[PDB]
Amino acid sequence: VGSLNCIVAVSQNMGIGKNGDFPWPPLRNEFRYFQRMTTTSSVEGKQNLVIMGKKTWFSIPEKNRPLKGRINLVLSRELKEPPQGAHFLSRSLDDALKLTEQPELANKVDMVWIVGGSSVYKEAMNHPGHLKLFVTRIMQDFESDTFFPEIDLEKYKLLPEYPGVLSDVQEEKGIKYKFEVYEKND
Template sequence: MPPPAPLELTLVLAATRDMGIGLHGGLPWTGLKKEMAYFARVTKRIPPSPSSSSSLPSQQDGTAPPAAAMKNAVIMGRKTWDSIPPRFRPLKGRLNVVISRSAASLSPSQTSPGAGVVDENEKKGDNEVIMAPSLEQALSYLGERRTNTGKIFVIGGGQIYGAALKSPQTKRILLTRVLSDFECDTFFPLVLGDDNNNNGGEWKRSSKENFDDWVGENVPEGVQEENGTRYEFQMWER
């Protein structure tokens, strides 16, 4: 049996034209319900087969794990976690992985394989929250549970994005390009311009066909508008 393919990371973010992503610990814009619904659908949707995502391994008999036993993972920093209203966290239907320096000093009721520590204080039903002191250790934990993990998304904030961009495991960026102007004090650490090729060719904007195929739906094309805020869905690949 061939060795499993390496884990792949996908960054998901909404950013202004100058790559602003936050203000005072929250989002600079409000009321983008359709954009938030898109985020939820894409980060929950399980790949239909191992060939659709290299982060999705086969079982020992070569078949894909049952969809019901599998979840995608969303990785975030502690500040991003804290910015989510308590009634909405953990994010349902996904394995929530929170990067926090304090994770190493927790006294958990359950220690998971690898670096993951289950935070029972934040667990709701079957929606567990995994704490890890670094992105590297979070990925080590996810590697331990690969047969139950689909796609892996990094959802913020700025420091976690920066760490992920340094990893060769980061293969794509799902960007909601906010075209309206907003004041921001936090920025994504990579500039993706308006053309289709950035950073000397390292990042290229995907075609609509590839975009739809990877996320598993017909993504709305062109400029969208909600509550006076204009934005566009894009996918960039390394």
């Protein structure tokens, strides 16, 4: 109902996963960042909705599923019902978005966050209108089996800054990374 946003951590080789996991060792503050960003609602009494593919839901450890304080929606054409812990199941990105507009969640959803995987990212990226990409650039190459789609710089503008997102290069476990925000409106 508010903003449509994507959030991803990508290596310099554009990788996002490896055998059901993140291609690098776990970054606990990257994660804290991901939690803070998708969890905070710019409006009282409203909650954010997170959309993810089926493989993304199964890659999150059980202890962490469902993502707390958010409406969790899984995308699948094969599941008959939401996985255990999940709140909604949709068969496509359009229906996930049309549901937002159901008087049910009428006034319950604030921002919508696309949290993975590839398939779900590309399709949000081609979705017309206004969208923001929140990209954590992991500054090294990592052997990966899943990639993030190409960012069209003719459509996406990298922002010079954004409220609540550090602009300095971070370092954890001896790997460097930085946070970026891209905006579109076609």
